[PDB]
Design a protein around this ligand. Structure first.
Ligand code: NAP
Ligand code: NAP
Ligand code: CA
Ligand code: CA
Lengths: 413, 412
């Protein structure tokens, strides 16, 4: 089904469980009818990441860097329960963590605002953008079970060959756990750049959260890198733009974030950008109401995703042959932002107007009273929602399609 | 001033605004009523630096001895603090030191005021966070890396064989590295205390980890809780109409945001730290939260303010400007400490004194007398004016006025 021709190639990464089911329908009804789109397909379904030894994940990452745009459905990350469940050869790493490792950059997350959906948090008047650092820390770590007594040490061995630098971290008297993790100056700096630059262009303030009182040298490095770069390259233009940058302790930032009105960029270390960008997304209404875009330092490569998970409890219900009502908006906006970036790379204005148009139609369709259960909950009580207040997953997508077909037909005479 | 205590309470003095407030609470709401032995330790930054942080260690060991510890918020120094106080070094968190020595779980909970509107529209009931007090980020070894090399991790068995070595990372230019740990023993301890506490509340229990990413580290948290539920707690919980569940941290923070509450949330050191601030501020103020570190045996309580020393307000204070610093958390550290002092001494009268003061604080807030953070909760941020609240001193005084009437009012 072709209409708008797209020269560029979109690298699509398929995922798992309920999101995989919605992914198919989104392609089927919202994208392909309108777009003549070259798709380099990569199945990051869990079975296929097992079949290929996770190499499908690595190749997909590399294919995104080549073509410039990636669009990824939520995937399962496996632990022991999951290894059992699929008879996996191993506990494979988060495909997300692997993609992010290879690409680098920053994951910008923002709520998708629907005026008829009450925010959960009375104070939040404006959107918060989270710049989550995509590299290192707890997401590329080495952890270990300890089985008996013994001493946990770190050796740093320099390249020159000067002697080993060792630290006794802990004497274990019994079983326990240990782990090491890292970050790089180079990375933190790209993470500083893109955050400073995004807030400069939104004309908004920038907060950095760390726990540099505790991790004096580790988090300390982030604080100093951001402060050094601010003085050097952003203070003058920030002060001229009527905005400001400040380091705040993670403690104080979450309290501020909860009570403030929004209108600022909040830069988080990896883990905080993981946790808080869900607290935020649910605060604004639902996990399905959020964009998530991994951006290059150079602005040429974009991996757009849904930030939420595979919606396992909903899939278990879909698998019984029971009805589901799962919010597909975050999956759809993975596509639109990917296609928007695709069109920017190609000098293709038609593609950008389509991407924007699909975002308008989703938001407008929700705004006109047509919505999945989770948004109906935001409006009507937790226990005072009924079947007539919301559309199921299929209907919602169907309604969305009806509207998109109509809007597109009218759109560019 | 006294009237009411045999057993001893160990007092830990702190920094900045919480210090200023700590004094007033002792002056006006505690010592006037209680004749109590206090073992005083000054964890103000100057004395920590001056004693090479030994008063902190001494304070932690005093708490184990007499069984009750009451602690004011302290500074934990980074580089700017070292400059500011002319410190010998970037001393580690005194809280992190107290907890490393004492072990256990820090249980936190909002202090409900009916005239204070919640910021989260869905929260009908309290959320209780159970924070693992040990290990992980708060007893870790972190370094800056200045040039390329290899970050290895060695475990050297007691048995004397050979080291178990993992390559973590090949550095090319500069960075940071850290190493951190926890123990089966502490994690197990953390679980039992959460299971017992959610069992006695007849409330469900959630543990959150990121075991999909930290598969062995967080996996151990998840495996230990699960095995303990099966063996020791699943049957009793099912009889009580409650459950235990592990959720991924992503799932739990989203759930907590849309839940009505009424559950005990088991949090890893880092998560309990951060999510207890998000939860206190979601309920109305950082001022309106309790925080009680409990020992595995439950013979030893350290109570505190979970929030910081309120540096921005200390600075107003220093210039002679008017402050409205919420003192309720600092007050409830006294009351919960003493509650346990009374629990230990079988002092029926002291348990009730603590209970009464808590009653009077909230009851005073609910009669319209409050500090500026709580006025901002009722009126808007931009619509509060001076007449909606009391400054810090007046507020403590109003409570003080109020507490005397109340106490005098009781038994007679
Ligand atoms: N983007 C990614 O690649 C990504 C991110 C996170 C996790 N994961 C992986 O996916 C799985 C996550 O499962 P999880 O249950 O922990 O997290 P989850 O799949 O994000 O779902 C958690 C819950 O949040 C609500 N929710 C999330 N997305 C929703 C949507 N689109 N529409 C409606 N409700 C939604 C539902 O609550 P109710 O039950 O109340 O309806 C749902 O049960 C794990 O296997 C994990 O490895 C992947
Ligand atoms: N228990 C502890 O020992 C503990 C805990 C946390 C931090 N700290 C230490 O405290 C110092 C400063 O930390 P921080 O500035 O990150 O956080 P903070 O002192 O907790 O205060 C940060 C902000 O939260 C609000 N706030 C906190 N407590 C309040 C109260 N009792 N009444 C009214 N408002 C209150 C204020 O908001 P507004 O600005 O909006 O008025 C304040 O500016 C650091 O040295 C840190 O290491 C100690
Ligand atoms: Ca997340
Ligand atoms: Ca905290």
């Amino acid at each position: 089904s072709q209409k708008i021709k797209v020269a560029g190639t979109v690298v699509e990464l398929d995922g798992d469980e309920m999101t995989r089911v919605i992914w198919k329908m989104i392609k089927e009804e919202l994208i392909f009818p309108f777009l003549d789109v070259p798709i380099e397909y990569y199945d990051l379904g869990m079975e296929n990441r097992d079949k290929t030894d996770d190499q499908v994940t690595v190749d997909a990452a590399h294919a995104i860097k080549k073509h410039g745009v990636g669009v990824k459905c939520a995937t399962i990350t496996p632990d022991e329960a999951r290894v059992r469940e699929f008879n996996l050869k191993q506990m494979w790493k988060s495909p997300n963590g692997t993609i992010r490792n290879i690409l680098g950059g920053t994951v910008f997350r923002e709520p998708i605002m629907c005026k008829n959906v009450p925010r959960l948090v009375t104070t939040w008047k404006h959107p918060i953008v989270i710049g989550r650092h995509a590299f290192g820390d707890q997401y590329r770590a080495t952890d270990l079970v300890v089985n008996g007594p013994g001493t946990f040490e770190i050796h740093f061995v320099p390249e020159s060959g000067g002697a080993a630098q060792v630290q006794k971290v802990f004497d274990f008297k019994s079983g326990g756990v240990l782990m090491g993790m890292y970050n790089t100056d180079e990375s933190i700096k790209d993470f500083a750049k893109s955050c400073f630059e995004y807030a400069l262009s939104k004309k908004w303030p920038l907060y950095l959260s760390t726990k540099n009182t505790i991790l004096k040298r580790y988090d300390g490095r982030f604080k100093d890198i951001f402060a050094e770069m601010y003085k050097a390259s952003y203070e003058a233009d920030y002060k001229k733009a009527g905005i400001w940058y400040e380091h705040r302790l993670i403690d104080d930032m979450v309290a501020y974030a909860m009570k403030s009105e929004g209108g600022y960029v909040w830069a988080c270390k990896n883990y905080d950008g993981d946790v808080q960008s869900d607290s935020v997304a649910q605060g604004f209404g639902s996990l399905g109401l959020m964009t998530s875009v991994l951006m290059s330092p150079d602005g040429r490569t974009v991996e757009a995703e849904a930030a939420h998970g595979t919606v396992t409890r909903h899939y278990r219900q879909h698998q019984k042959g029971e009805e589901t009502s799962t919010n597909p908006v975050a999956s759809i906006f993975a596509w639109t932002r990917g296609l928007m970036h695709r069109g920017k790379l190609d000098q293709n204005e038609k593609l950008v107007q389509f991407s924007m148009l699909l975002e308008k139609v989703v938001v407008s369709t929700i705004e006109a009273g047509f919505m999945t259960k989770d948004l109906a909950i935001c409006i009507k009580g937790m226990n005072h929602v009924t079947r007539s207040d919301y559309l199921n997953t299929q209907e919602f997508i169907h309604k969305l399609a009806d509207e998109m077909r109509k809007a597109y037909e009218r759109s560019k005479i």
